[PDB]
Amino acid sequence: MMVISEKVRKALNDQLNREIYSSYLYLSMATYFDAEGFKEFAHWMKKQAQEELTHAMKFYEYIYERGGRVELEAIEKPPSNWNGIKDAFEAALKHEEFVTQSIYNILELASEEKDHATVSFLKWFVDEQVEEEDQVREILDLLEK
């Protein structure tokens, strides 16, 4: 029996697929960095790509622990190229801000439905999102030289 709403399941399935695309996007940044010779920037991107896949599997597991099912969707082709380093890290920041808004939106939905388990789940992700935007913002400040 599923003890989440079909609309919170759908929302969480949508976020799982965003984390996979996030993963793919950061892998694509590594292909750029690696081609332009920045092997340490590529290495971070590959770490990030792995970590976004662990985010997606926590949603995967949560959905199944509450009796839902996961359906995987097509993943769009990510950009392969940026107009230099700053451009690449700004795209990353902009994508993380979009990811955060998307989780905040699910957090509003699950509150209106008084789903306390899902609320508790997403608060861990909010905190990680605040950390990840500030990591990228910090990179961007250091690049300003």
Identity of the residue, 74 or 142, whose beta carbon is nearer to a copy of itself in the bound complex: 142
**CA gap 80, 58 in Å, rounded:** 28
**CA gap 18, 60 in Å, rounded:** 12
DSSP 84: S
Identity of the residue, 32 or 44, whose beta carbon is nearer to a copy of itself in the bound complex: 44
Identity of the residue, 52 or 115, whose beta carbon is nearer to Fe ion in the bound complex: 52
CB 98 to a copy of itself: min, Å: 21
Task: Tell me whether residue 15 is annotated as binding.
Answer: no
Task: Tell me whether residue 83 is annotated as binding.
Answer: no
- Contact between 55 and Fe ion by CB under 5 A: the answer reads yes
Contact 55, 125 (CB under 8 A): yes
Cα–Cα distances in angstroms (integers) from residue 55 to residues 8, 51, 86, 89, in the given order: 17, 6, 25, 20
| Partner whose binding site includes residue 50, from Fe ion, Zn ion, a copy of itself, none (CB under 5 to 8 Å by kind) | none
The number of residues in the chain equals: 145
- Contact between 127 and a copy of itself by CB under 8 A: the answer reads yes
**CA gap 93, 145 in Å, rounded:** 19
- Contact between 116 and a copy of itself by CB under 8 A: the answer reads no
Known binding-site residues for Zn(2+) equal 19, 43, 51-52, 96, 128, 131-132, 138
